């Protein structure tokens, strides 16, 4: 039962990504976290994090990615490069559950500099807890882009 | 002149005329070429998505605009293609930062999140916002290419 | 049974009948009554405003829904009230706290800057969201009261 | 040319105020920023803060105010309660100026629980900086707010 969640950030996201551990942890029994790095305020580029969140969950060494950055566009750029991965930019709880039930997205990205702590915590809940809708018409549109891949 | 192919799915097609008129109030440098849907009919966003994506990429157009229901399905397959960094945008920060530091070269928008006045600032922020040139932007998005081989 | 009086002015006025349709859909028990404009004619959103606002304090209607362009002038207007608590909300999480933490009795919405579905997710979460019933906010809200004498 | 800018929050806004003193001392040469309580994460009633900074605001003491709780809500509320004053809830670019341009505010209500600090910081810079639109279909608007008081 055990979903390890990978989360990485780059230089701006790194001061909260304890918060961001902790919205994973109680989303729900199952959630676990595991934060990549970065561990300073040292300046880091994020499509190093990114990659090595997307392709953990692309080889099934976490079944959901978390990517944090100033405003989430340069993650969710660099993550969907990983074939696979369908990485989705949310800001509210309406894109955390579109992402899931039409996307299935496998990855959230996020911005510290644009949402607040609790919008945050609530994409995450919503993004974790909510499932794919597991319809024909959302599956053969993911085909089309597993094919582009 | 700048050559801007926007494609919407059936969600957007009801305001691909507004969002065409966004683009000529940004400038008269600017060509909207709306490659489709053109009607109601139920069609698949990645068929647009990629469509538009492969002409940016090409260098067939110069910028790309794509709308669905929340922006996310069209980020998601649009960043499939090589050369492609596309920004799902929600507001005049997000669409300033795609442009400033991640030089996007497609912005994605939600009909149904997404309202037309808010719509249209992020159309004109996005066409005229330059790139910030700076080193560590740069080396961040050639990490992005470097992924894409 | 409970009464929505819902105001626009011309600005709010296209989505309106979306509105109507928004709050039955938040369940059997909710009676929309739309009281104008029922044109295009440019009219003055405090006129609306202060209509619907007078109404819900007088007890005439038990909630009320307010659209402009942005949502702030009917905000301002409606405010001035006494006995009402009108807030302006923007997503899922705006909305669940003007109802647990603001008892709000009338949600203020904008045409220009909120897209449909979330719209519709603001109203219908506003309508069933309870207040939280806890006292600290209760001792809030008759702090504002007793500023309206 | 010194424009002083009341500043208020409760405990939920307490922890972002050294950052909201910057952005206002940053956003002009002439704006001044006053930061009026709280000091403490002691609980504290967002109405009290509220009402004082729009009675400043009102008195010609300072001639802005702005006031963050959570969500901002409760501030535009308690603040819109006090004849004078036209207090806007602002979580984005757009509605910063629109609040400015259309609705004359005197007072800008932010969330730190939903806003980003970058947001934030373009938000409080716009509306400092917008002027009012000077413009009669407005001001007839504005009239018939203050009526209502």
């Known amino acids: 039962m055990t979903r390890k969640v990978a989360i990485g950030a780059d230089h701006i996201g790194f001061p909260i990504h304890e918060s961001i551990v902790r919205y994973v942890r109680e989303a729900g029994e199952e959630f676990e976290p595991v934060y ?16 090595n969140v997307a392709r953990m969950v692309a080889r099934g060494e976490a ?23 369908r ?15 039409h996307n299935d997205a496998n990855v959230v990205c996020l ?7 609790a919008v945050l915590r609530e ?7 909510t499932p794919y809708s597991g319809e024909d018409r959302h ?11």
Chains 1, 4 share one sequence.
Do not use: W
């Open 36 to 51: 990549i790095g970065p561990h300073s305020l040292e300046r880091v580029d994020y499509p190093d994090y990114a990659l």
């Open 63 to 85: 079944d959901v990615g978390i990517l944090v950055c100033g405003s989430g566009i340069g993650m969710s750029i660099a993550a969907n490069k990983v074939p696979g991965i």
């Open 87 to 101: 990485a989705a930019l949310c800001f509210d709880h309406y894109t955390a559950v579109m992402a899931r039930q």
């Open 111 to 117: 911005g510290e500099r644009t949402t607040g702590p």
């Open 123 to 129: 994409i995450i809940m919503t993004f974790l807890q």
């Open 139 to 149: 599956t053969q549109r993911l085909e089309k882009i597993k094919a582009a891949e």
